[PDB]
């Protein structure tokens, strides 16, 4: 049918997005899907959208929100520049590593309840992870849940007197433990936030596995040298490290001992010059940012 075809159409494949096309806050990762048109189609203003893109657009990459609007225009920005940030990261050949030494999210590991010993930490995270929830929809998590949990009273009024009667007659320090486990055991079958929207690992920035060496005609490369730019002429206030602009990413540059004298000389125009840096490590934070650490390799 036509409905089946539409669901699989290339336009349906693009997930709905209404995030501001002009965002002036902090950008940590791509927010819009880049659309590309071939040179032949660009010559005919064809992008596979509803309407022809104006001929003024010469780029072959754009990002859009709405196919059509009440203003009879498409809401789009003729830019595709987050792809070059990803490809420049690939050229730096620095694998992303976990600063906490967690399991690789891209491998199906056999995990155990080592961290599940915090059942009361995360079972209540469902009601306590409400930082940005409505004052009454979050309050609907109190009566709606209470009825659901109150429907298991009979089950827990028998299991507890059949598996741990001593605690019911001595102390509730262990009873509270049996309660947290009970609900989780009766909730694992349930589906509360069964889909987790948190970023998985690198989020797709890099699929490179650590360990491989870079062979070169001049021998194996031991230190990666990448051109960059120093943004500030004074270390980040309250931090012992300056900031550099390397390959579309802002890194923290650590200097060997002293800061090169071109800093004082150039002043606030220091960004006008290119320096060579060494990328020590790259980490991924939960916000979805990349923590790139560099070192200002100076001619010596």
């Amino acid at each position: 049918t036509l409905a089946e075809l539409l669901g699989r159409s290339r336009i349906a494949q693009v997930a709905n997005n209404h995030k501001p096309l002009t965002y002036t806050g902090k950008k940590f990762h791509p927010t819009h899907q880049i659309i590309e048109t071939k040179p032949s189609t660009l010559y005919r203003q064809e992008w596979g959208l509803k309407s022809a893109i104006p001929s003024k657009i010469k780029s072959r990459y754009l990002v859009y929100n709405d196919l059509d609007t009440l203003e009879r225009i498409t809401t789009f920005e003729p830019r595709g520049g987050t792809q070059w940030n990803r490809l420049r990261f690939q050229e730096m050949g620095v694998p992303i590593v976990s600063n906490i030494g967690r399991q690789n999210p891209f491998f199906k590991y056999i995990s155990r309840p080592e961290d599940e010993s915090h059942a009361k930490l995360s079972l209540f995270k469902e009601m306590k992870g409400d930082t940005d929830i409505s004052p009454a929809a979050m309050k609907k998590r109190l009566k709606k849940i209470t009825a659901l949990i109150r429907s298991f009273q009979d089950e827990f009024k028998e299991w507890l007197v059949e598996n741990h009667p001593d605690e019911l007659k001595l102390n509730s320090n262990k009873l509270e433990d049996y309660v947290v486990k009970f609900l989780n055991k009766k909730l694992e079958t349930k589906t509360n936030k069964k889909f987790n929207t948190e970023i998985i690992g690198t989020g797709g920035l890099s699929y490179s596995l650590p360990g491989k060496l870079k062979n070169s005609p001049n021998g194996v490369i031991q230190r990666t040298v990448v051109p960059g730019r120093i943004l500030n002429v004074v270390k980040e206030n309250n931090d012992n490290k300056w900031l550099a602009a390397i390959g579309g990413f802002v890194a923290d540059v650590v200097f060997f001992q002293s800061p090169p004298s071109s800093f004082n000389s150039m002043g606030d125009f220091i960004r006008m010059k290119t320096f060579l840096f060494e990328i020590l490590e790259a980490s991924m934070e939960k916000n979805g940012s990349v923590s790139m650490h560099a070192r200002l390799l100076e001619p010596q």
Binding site: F124, M127, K128, L142, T146, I149, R150, F152, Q153, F156, K157, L160, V161, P165, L168, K169, S172, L175, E176, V179, F182, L183
Partner: protein, 128 residues
């Protein structure tokens, strides 16, 4: 066109309808009655902080207007829900067999229904 426009309710259908409607009215009255008793229980738990005698008044005044006591001066955004939400969760699961100082009507219902006693003996008999 030949079909009758309306079919009157059979006497049996009217009986079942009346049963459901009486049940609906009775259930709502019962649920409101129990809600009121649960609020009366939660008010009893706090009536120890309320003053009805001069002796209580003199003790409250001293305890609040004392140099050691802290006063709400609202000069800074003091830092630190869960506590009151944990008492609710425990009183919903445990019910009569709860350890919370501020319990719900479940405990009072089990008492008058020979449940907290018919379980205490049951547990003790099991221990035997």
């Amino acid at each position: 066109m030949s079909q009758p426009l309306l079919r009157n309710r059979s006497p049996e259908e009217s009986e079942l309808l009346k049963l459901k409607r009486n049940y609906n009215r009775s259930l709502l009255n019962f649920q409101a009655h129990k809600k009121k008793l649960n609020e009366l229980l939660n008010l009893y738990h706090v009536a120890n902080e309320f003053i009805v005698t001069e002796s209580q008044l003199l003790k409250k005044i001293d305890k609040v207007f004392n140099d050691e006591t802290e006063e709400f001066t609202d000069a800074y955004d003091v830092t630190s829900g869960n506590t009151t939400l944990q008492t609710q969760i425990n009183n919903a699961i445990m019910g009569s067999l709860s350890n919370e100082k501020f319990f719900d009507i479940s405990l009072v219902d089990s008492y008058l229904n020979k449940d907290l006693k018919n379980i205490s003996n049951k547990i003790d008999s099991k221990l035997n």
